[PDB]
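Figure caption, in words: inputs first, then the predicted bound structure.
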Amino acid sequence: KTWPAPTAPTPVRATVTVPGSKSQTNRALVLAALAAAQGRGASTISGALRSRDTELMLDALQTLGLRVDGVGSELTVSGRIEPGPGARVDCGLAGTVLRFVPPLAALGSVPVTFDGDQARGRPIAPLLDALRELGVAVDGTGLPFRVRGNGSLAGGTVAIDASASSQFVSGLLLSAASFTDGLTVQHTGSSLPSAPHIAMTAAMLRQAGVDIDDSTPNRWQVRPGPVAARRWDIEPDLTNAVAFLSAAVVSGGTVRITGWPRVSVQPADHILAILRQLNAVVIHADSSLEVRGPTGYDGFDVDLRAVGELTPSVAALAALASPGSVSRLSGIAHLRGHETDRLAALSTEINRLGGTCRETPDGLVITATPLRPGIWRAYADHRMAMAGAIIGLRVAGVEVDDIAATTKTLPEFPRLWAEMV
Ligand code: NA
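Bound structure (sodium ion present):
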């Protein structure tokens, strides 16, 4: 039933390896597969996330004939795409396999069936139409569909709403180096404000030496060529990393996160700015980031438009500021429209534990005040669960209602969190 959040009555002192980003893990797996398939060599992936979804990707690559080896977050990909008879790739809840793997199957010379199990889910017929437009011999308007590999994918130019289909656009860009004519993707909107997943993809392609030109607004062009075999050092995912750094901040202790990049495409700078304003010590060394928390801090006003995903951890920091302190978190009105309304959730849960959190047109106003034991609801949301864990470091008797909200995303979280404390 409930998960007792461990308390840190003395400062935490810990070195933690935070698992890698799911997005980067799946991107690296595809780029490693393509390099191997092209005969460019075996690649290694260090820091890979191991979860149900990344296991499904690993299985899909092995179905295509690639050799996958490793242990935990350390993987090697090698061999060739040679699927053989009756090859079938399970996709299921990993909408990622469906979007990233069909182009790779098209490089083989046999049929590969993609299957999974609703009426109320997102239709994939348009995805299949786009694959056909680029030269994939695929028949279906849904699952199951069969890519009939004939050793090449022509490529060309496709128009798509890259905001609505950003994962599919990433999938096409990942494999585009192998298309005969390359790929041009034209976004059909006149503006595209935030496309972090497409930008991550483009940055990773450049790390693999692929010629990608994204200099024109709303357009991405990849030229055909080899994908380099690399040592892919996957960056800790920023959201999860911040939960661990927040434990240093609230406990007044030290957390050192290993395998941190010299420069990151994730918005690490923005959160480090906030931590610096709470007077935490922040040291960016060799291949690690260390944060040491202060004995306490007062309230802060921060606009989180650029790092909306960090709202629950930041709200936890605000609730643990010196009593009486007022914090205003703004730039997050838009978050109300996401599947999970974390503003309503955060206000309810802080208030359930004896706190003071007010919803506002642009965000949350939190008054730090002493809290009491209770059941912190996660609402089946991993970020909400980590926020309760942060609160629990300082408040004895906080229990997160169901930690499965986090373990489905980050299986290692409860054990790594307990080892840290
Ligand atoms: Na209280």
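The CA atoms of residues 152 and 327 lie 56 Å apart.
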